[PDB]
mmCIF file of C-alpha atoms and ligand atoms in Angstrom:
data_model
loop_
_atom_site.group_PDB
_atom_site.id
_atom_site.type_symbol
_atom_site.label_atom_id
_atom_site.label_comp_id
_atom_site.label_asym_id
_atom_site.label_seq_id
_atom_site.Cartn_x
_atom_site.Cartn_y
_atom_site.Cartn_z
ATOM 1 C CA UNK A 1 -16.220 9.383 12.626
ATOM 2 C CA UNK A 2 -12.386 9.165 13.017
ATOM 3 C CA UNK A 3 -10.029 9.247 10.471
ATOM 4 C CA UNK A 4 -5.766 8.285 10.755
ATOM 5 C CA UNK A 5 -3.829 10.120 7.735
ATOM 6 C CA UNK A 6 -0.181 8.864 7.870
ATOM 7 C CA UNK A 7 2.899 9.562 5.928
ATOM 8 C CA UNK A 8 4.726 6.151 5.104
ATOM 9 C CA UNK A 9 7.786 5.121 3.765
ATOM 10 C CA UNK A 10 9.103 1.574 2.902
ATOM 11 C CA UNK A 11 8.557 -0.336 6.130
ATOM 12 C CA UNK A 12 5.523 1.186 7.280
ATOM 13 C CA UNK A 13 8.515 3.632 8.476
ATOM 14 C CA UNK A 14 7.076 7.345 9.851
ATOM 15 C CA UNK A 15 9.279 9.095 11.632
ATOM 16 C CA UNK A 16 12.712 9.227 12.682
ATOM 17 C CA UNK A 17 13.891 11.531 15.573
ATOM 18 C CA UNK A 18 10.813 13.209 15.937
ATOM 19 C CA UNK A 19 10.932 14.506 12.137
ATOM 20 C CA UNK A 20 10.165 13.594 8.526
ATOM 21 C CA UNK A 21 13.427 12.974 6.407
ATOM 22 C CA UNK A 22 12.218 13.484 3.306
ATOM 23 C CA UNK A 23 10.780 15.997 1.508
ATOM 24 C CA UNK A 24 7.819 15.780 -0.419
ATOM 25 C CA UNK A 25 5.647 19.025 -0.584
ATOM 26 C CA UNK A 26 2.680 17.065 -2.652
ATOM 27 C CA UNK A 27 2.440 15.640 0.376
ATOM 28 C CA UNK A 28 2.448 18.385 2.481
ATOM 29 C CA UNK A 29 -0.789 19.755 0.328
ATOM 30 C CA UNK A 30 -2.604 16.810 0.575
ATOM 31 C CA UNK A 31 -2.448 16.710 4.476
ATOM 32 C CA UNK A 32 -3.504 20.213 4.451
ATOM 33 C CA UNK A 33 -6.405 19.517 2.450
ATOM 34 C CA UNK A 34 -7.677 16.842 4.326
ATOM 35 C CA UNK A 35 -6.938 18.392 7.393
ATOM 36 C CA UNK A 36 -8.116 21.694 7.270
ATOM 37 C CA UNK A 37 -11.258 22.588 9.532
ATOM 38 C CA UNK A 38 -11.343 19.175 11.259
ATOM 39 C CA UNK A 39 -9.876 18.551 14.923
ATOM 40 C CA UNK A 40 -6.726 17.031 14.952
ATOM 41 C CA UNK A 41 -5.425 14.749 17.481
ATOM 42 C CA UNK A 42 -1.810 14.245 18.403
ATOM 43 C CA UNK A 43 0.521 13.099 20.890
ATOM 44 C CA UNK A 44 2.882 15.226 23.077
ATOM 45 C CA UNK A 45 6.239 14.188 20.687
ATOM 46 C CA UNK A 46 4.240 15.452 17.463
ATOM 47 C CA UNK A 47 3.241 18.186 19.021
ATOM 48 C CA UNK A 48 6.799 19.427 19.447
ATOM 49 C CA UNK A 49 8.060 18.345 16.573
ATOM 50 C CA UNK A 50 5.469 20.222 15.013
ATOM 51 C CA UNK A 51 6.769 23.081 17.169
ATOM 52 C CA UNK A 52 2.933 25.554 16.604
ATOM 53 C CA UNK A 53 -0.744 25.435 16.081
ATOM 54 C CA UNK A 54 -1.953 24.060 12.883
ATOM 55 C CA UNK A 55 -4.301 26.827 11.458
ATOM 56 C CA UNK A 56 -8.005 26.355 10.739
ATOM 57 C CA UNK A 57 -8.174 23.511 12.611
ATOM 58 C CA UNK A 58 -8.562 22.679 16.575
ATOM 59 C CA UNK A 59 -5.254 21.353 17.921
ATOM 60 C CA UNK A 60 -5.774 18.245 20.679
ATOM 61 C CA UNK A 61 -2.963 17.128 22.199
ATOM 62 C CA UNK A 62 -2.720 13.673 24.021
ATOM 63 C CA UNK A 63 -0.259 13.914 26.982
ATOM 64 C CA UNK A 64 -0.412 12.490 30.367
ATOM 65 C CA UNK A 65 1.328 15.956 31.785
ATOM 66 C CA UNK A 66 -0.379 19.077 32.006
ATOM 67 C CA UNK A 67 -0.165 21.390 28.990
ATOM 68 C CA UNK A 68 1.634 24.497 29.204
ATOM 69 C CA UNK A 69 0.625 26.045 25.946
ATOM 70 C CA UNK A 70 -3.050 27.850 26.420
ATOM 71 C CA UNK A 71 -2.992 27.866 22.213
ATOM 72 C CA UNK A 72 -3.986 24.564 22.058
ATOM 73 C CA UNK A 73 -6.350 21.881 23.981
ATOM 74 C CA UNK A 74 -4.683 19.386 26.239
ATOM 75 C CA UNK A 75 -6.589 15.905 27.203
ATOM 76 C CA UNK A 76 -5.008 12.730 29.252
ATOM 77 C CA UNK A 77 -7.060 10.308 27.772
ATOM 78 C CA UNK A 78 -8.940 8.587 24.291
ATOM 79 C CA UNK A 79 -12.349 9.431 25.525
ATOM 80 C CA UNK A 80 -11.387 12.862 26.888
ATOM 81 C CA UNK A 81 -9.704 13.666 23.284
ATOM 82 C CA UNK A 82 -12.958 12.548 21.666
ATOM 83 C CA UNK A 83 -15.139 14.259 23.807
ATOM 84 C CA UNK A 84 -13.236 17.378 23.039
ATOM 85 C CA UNK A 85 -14.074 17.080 19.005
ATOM 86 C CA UNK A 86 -17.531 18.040 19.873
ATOM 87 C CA UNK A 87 -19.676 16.558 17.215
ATOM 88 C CA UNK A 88 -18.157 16.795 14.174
ATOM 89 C CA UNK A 89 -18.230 14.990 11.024
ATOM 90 C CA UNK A 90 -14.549 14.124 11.088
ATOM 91 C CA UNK A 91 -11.539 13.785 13.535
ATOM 92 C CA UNK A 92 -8.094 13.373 12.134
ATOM 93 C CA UNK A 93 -6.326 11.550 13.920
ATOM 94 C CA UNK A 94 -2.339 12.766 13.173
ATOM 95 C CA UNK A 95 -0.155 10.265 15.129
ATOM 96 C CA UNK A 96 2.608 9.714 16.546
ATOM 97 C CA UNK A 97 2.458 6.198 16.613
ATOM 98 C CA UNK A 98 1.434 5.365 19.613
ATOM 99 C CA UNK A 99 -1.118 7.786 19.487
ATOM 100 C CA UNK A 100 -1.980 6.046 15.821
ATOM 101 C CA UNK A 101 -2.076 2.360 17.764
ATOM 102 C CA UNK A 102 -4.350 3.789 20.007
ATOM 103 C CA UNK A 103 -6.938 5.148 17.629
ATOM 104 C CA UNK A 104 -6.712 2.420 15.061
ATOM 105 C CA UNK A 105 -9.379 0.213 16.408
ATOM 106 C CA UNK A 106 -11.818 3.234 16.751
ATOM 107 C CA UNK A 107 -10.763 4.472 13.303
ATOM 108 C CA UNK A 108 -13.179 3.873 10.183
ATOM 109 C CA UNK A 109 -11.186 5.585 7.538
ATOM 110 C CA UNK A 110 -7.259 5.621 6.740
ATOM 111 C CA UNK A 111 -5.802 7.756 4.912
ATOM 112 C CA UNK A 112 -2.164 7.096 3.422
ATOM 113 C CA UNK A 113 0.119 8.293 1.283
ATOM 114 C CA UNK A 114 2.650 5.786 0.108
ATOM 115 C CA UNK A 115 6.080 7.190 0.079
ATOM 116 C CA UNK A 116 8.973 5.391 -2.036
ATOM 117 C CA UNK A 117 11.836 5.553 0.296
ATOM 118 C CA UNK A 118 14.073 3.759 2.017
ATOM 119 C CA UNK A 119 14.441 5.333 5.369
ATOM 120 C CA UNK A 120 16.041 4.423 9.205
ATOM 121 C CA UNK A 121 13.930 5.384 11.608
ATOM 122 C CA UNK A 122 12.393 3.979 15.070
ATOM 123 C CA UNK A 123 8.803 4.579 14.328
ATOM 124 C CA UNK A 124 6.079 2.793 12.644
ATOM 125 C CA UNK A 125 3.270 2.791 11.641
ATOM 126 C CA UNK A 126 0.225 0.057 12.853
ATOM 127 C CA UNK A 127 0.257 -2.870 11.291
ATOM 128 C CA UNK A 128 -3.410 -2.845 10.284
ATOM 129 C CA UNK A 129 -5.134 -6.335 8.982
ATOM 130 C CA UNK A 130 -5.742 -5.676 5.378
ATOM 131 C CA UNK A 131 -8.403 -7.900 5.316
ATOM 132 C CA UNK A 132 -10.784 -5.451 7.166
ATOM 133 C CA UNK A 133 -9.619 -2.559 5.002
ATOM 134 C CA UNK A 134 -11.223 -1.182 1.530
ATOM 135 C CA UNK A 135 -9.701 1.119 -0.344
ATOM 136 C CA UNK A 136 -11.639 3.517 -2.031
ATOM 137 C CA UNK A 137 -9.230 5.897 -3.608
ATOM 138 C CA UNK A 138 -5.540 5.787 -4.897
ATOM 139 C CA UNK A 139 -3.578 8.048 -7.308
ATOM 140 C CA UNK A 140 0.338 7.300 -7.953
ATOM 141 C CA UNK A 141 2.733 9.814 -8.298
ATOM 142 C CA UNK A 142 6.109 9.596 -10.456
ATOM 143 C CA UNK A 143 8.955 11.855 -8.573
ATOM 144 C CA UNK A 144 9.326 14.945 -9.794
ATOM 145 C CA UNK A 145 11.936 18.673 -9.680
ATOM 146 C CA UNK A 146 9.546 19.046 -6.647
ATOM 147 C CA UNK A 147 8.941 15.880 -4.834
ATOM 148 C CA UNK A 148 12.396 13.695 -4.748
ATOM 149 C CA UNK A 149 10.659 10.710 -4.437
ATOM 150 C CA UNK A 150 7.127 8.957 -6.240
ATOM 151 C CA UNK A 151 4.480 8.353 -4.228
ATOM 152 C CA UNK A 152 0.543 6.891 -3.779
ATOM 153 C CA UNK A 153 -2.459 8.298 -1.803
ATOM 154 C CA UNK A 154 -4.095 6.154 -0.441
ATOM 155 C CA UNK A 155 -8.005 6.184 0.838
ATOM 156 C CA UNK A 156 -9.282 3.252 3.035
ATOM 157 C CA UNK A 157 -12.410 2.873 4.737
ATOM 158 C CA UNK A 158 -13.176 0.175 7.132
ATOM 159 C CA UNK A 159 -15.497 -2.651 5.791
HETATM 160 O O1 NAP B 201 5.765 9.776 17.314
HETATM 161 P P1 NAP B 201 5.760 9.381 18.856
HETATM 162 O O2 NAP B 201 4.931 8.196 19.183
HETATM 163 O O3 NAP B 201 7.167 9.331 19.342
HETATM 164 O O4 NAP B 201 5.014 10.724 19.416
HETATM 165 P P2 NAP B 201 3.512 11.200 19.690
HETATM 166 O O5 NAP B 201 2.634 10.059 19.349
HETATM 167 O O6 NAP B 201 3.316 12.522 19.073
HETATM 168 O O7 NAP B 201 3.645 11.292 21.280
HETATM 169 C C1 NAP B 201 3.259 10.185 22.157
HETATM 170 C C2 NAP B 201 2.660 10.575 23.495
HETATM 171 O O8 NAP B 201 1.386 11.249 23.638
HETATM 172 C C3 NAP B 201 0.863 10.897 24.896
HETATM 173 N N1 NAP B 201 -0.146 9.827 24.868
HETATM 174 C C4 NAP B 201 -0.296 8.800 23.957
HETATM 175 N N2 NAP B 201 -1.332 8.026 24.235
HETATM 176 C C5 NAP B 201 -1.914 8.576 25.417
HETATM 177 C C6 NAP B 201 -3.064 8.231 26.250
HETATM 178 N N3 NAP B 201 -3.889 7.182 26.031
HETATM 179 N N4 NAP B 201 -3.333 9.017 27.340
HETATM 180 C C7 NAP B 201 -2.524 10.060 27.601
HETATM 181 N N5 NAP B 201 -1.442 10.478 26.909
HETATM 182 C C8 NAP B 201 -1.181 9.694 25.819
HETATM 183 C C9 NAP B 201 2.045 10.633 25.826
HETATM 184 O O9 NAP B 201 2.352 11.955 26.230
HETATM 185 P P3 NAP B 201 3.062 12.153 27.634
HETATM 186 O O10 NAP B 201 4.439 11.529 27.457
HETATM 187 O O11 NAP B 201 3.152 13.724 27.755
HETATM 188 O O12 NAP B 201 2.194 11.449 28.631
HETATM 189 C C10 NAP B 201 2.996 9.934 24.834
HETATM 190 O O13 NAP B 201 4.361 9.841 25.169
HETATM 191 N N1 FOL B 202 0.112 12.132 4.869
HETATM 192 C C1 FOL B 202 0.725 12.611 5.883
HETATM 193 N N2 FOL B 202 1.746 13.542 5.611
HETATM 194 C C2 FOL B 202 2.494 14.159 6.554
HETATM 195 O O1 FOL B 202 3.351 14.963 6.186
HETATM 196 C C3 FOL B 202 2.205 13.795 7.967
HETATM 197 N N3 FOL B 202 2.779 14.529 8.989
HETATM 198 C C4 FOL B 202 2.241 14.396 10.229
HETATM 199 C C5 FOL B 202 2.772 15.165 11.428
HETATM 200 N N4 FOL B 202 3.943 16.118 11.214
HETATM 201 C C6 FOL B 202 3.703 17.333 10.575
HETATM 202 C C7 FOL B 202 4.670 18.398 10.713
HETATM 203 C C8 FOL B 202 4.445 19.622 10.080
HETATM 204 C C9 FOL B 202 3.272 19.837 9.299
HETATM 205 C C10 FOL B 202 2.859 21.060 8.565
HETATM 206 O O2 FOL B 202 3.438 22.148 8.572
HETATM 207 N N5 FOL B 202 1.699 21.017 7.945
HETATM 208 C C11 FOL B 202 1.100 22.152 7.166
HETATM 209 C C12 FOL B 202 1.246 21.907 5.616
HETATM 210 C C13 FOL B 202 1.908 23.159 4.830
HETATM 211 C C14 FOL B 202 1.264 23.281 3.444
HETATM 212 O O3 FOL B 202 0.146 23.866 3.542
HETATM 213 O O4 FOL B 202 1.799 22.823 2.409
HETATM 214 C C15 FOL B 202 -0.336 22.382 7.566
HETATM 215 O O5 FOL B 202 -0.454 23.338 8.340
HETATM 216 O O6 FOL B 202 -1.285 21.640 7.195
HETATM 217 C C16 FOL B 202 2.399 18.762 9.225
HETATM 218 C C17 FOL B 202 2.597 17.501 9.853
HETATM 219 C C18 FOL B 202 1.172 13.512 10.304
HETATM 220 N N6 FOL B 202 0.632 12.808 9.347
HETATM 221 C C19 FOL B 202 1.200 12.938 8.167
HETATM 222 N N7 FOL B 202 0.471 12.297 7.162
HETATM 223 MN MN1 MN B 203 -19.242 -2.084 4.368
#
């Protein structure tokens, strides 16, 4: 079953410039933990910005150009990238957006963390109908010496 976990700021905002403004490193743990030893899927722009291989996981990237990076598993298309997860409990689903808008409708759980933040950027994230959404999980977080900013994960499963 797929999965979309998404970092967002005020305005559904994800990215600017290919990179993530701020820095919150409770957030970087979280996306670890609900990454690790699951696929993940990706476009070609997060790929770079990601600049490596995520470890303990299966990197699929999305791109209608030929990879040129033997490290990691290139498909051109949805079905391909699914095909590629083998069967597996659990694909994450990592963005960029449009990779995000294209998984959405497949997707059965989302999983968000709420970031309290005022941000620029050019990216965003899918506006998905609440009404189809239940969440099944949230924990708040007041900003701390270690994350600038507060912030909420979020768990929602499709109803
Ligand atoms: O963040 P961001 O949106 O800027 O970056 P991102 O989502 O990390 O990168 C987006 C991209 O991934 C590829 N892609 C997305 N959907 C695809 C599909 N259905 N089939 C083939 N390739 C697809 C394209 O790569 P290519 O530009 O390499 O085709 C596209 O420009
Ligand atoms: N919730 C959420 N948070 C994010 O930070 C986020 N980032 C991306 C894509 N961009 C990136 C760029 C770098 C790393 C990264 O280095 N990840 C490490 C975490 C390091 C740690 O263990 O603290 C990893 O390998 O999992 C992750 C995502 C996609 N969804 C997101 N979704
Ligand atoms: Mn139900």
């Amino acid at each position: 079953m797929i999965s979309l976990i998404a970092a967002l700021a005020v305005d559904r905002v994800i990215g600017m410039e290919n990179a993530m403004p701020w820095n919150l490193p409770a957030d970087l743990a979280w996306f670890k933990r609900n990454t690790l030893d699951k696929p993940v899927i990706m476009g070609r722009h997060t790929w770079e910005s990601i600049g490596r291989p995520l470890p303990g996981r299966k990197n699929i990237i999305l791109s209608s150009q030929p990879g040129t990076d033997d490290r990691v598993t290139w498909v051109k298309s949805v079905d391909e990238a699914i095909a590629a997860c083998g069967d597996v409990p659990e694909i994450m689903v990592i963005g960029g957006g449009r990779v995000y808008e294209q998984f959405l409708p497949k997707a059965q759980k989302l999983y968000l963390t709420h970031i309290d933040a005022e941000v620029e950027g050019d990216t965003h994230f899918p506006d998905y109908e609440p009404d189809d959404w239940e969440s099944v999980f949230s924990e708040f977080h007041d900003a701390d010496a270690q994350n600038s900013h507060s912030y909420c994960f979020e768990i929602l499963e499709r109803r």
